């Protein structure tokens, strides 16, 4: 099997995103500490969870972040 997801993570830098395989799921945890903006301060955080299909090796799961702010999590077909 394979795994392939694309995510918009526009407010987060690579160091603010944590991807992990926990059980039968791929978890994405993005968090940024308080930062200034036009009107005040803003801190943001999200947690996304996707299931990992049976024929996919958790060790084959890679993650990359594009200069456009698109996070792609993939596991090539086995």
């Amino acid at each position: 099997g394979h795994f392939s997801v694309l995510l918009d993570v526009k407010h987060f830098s690579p160091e603010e995103i944590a991807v992990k395989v926990v059980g039968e799921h791929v978890e994405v945890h993005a968090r940024h500490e308080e930062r200034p903006d036009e009107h005040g301060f803003v801190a943001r955080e999200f947690h996304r969870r996707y299931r990992l299909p049976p024929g996919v090796d958790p060790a084959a799961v890679t993650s990359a972040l594009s200069p456009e702010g698109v996070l792609s999590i993939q596991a090539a077909p086995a």
């Binding site: 690579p14 991807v19 890679t62």
Partner: peptide, 9 residues
């Protein structure tokens, strides 16, 4: 639990 490095690209 296995960690997945976020590769800058």
């Amino acid at each position: 639990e296995i960690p997945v490095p976020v590769q800058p690209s």
